[PDB]
């Protein structure tokens, strides 16, 4: 099924205690696992703008909270091992605090 939602991921408690050279790569992997949990799709693709948002303050300056837009869509290629995949985009907001999960109407 095709669906789009906006989430907030708490990267602070997921990166708590991580070595400074590994913080941003582990943030990438935590976002992939987060999307896999919320959409049931092992295929998760992150937008390069989301990668920029993760890496904006260096390798050890990841944000505590990130506002993500996750779209479960259809894998249109006929060689796909899974029929659906997740696409994760950044949501550049005034503040990531106090935001609940919402459903975006795909129009």
């Amino acid at each position: 099924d095709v669906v789009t939602r906006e989430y907030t991921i708490n990267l602070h408690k997921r990166l708590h205690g991580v070595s400074f050279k590994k913080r941003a790569p582990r943030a990438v992997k935590e976002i992939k696992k987060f999307a896999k949990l919320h959409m049931g799709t092992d295929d998760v693709r992150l937008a390069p703008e989301l990668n920029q948002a993760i890496w904006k303050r260096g390798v050890k300056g990841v944000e505590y909270r990130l506002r993500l837009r996750i779209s479960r869509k259809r894998n249109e290629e006929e060689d796909a091992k899974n029929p659906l995949f997740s696409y994760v985009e950044p949501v550049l907001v005034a503040s990531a605090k106090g935001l609940q999960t919402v459903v975006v109407e795909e129009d």
Partner: protein, 100 residues
């Protein structure tokens, strides 16, 4: 809105490591132009007319090369060593036939 503009500018800019690409050298799309001008709230009639004129001017007409060679390729046997027509092939010039 001002806070959102600050956040978007911070995400876009990377000035400490490299410069921003020049807009005079880049090109953009009329779909993005129309959506931005619609967000600003102008009238898109003149811009849409200019885009329609440009699109109707940019015409593709099938030529004889499209008719004959459009779905084909090659026309010449590919050499084993990637050589030109008059380039010697030290390894294989003594063996004329491909079976041998």
């Amino acid at each position: 809105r001002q806070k959102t503009m600050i956040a978007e500018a911070r995400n876009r800019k990377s000035l400490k490591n490299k410069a921003i690409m020049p807009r005079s050298k880049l090109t953009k799309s009329f779909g993005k132009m129309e959506e931005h001008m619609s967000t600003l709230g102008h009238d898109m009639s003149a811009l849409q007319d200019k885009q329609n004129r440009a699109a109707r001017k940019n015409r593709y007409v099938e030529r004889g090369s499209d008719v004959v060679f459009g779905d084909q390729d090659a026309l010449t046997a590919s050499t084993e060593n990637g050589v030109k027509l008059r380039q010697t092939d030290r390894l294989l010039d003594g063996v004329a036939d491909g079976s041998m």
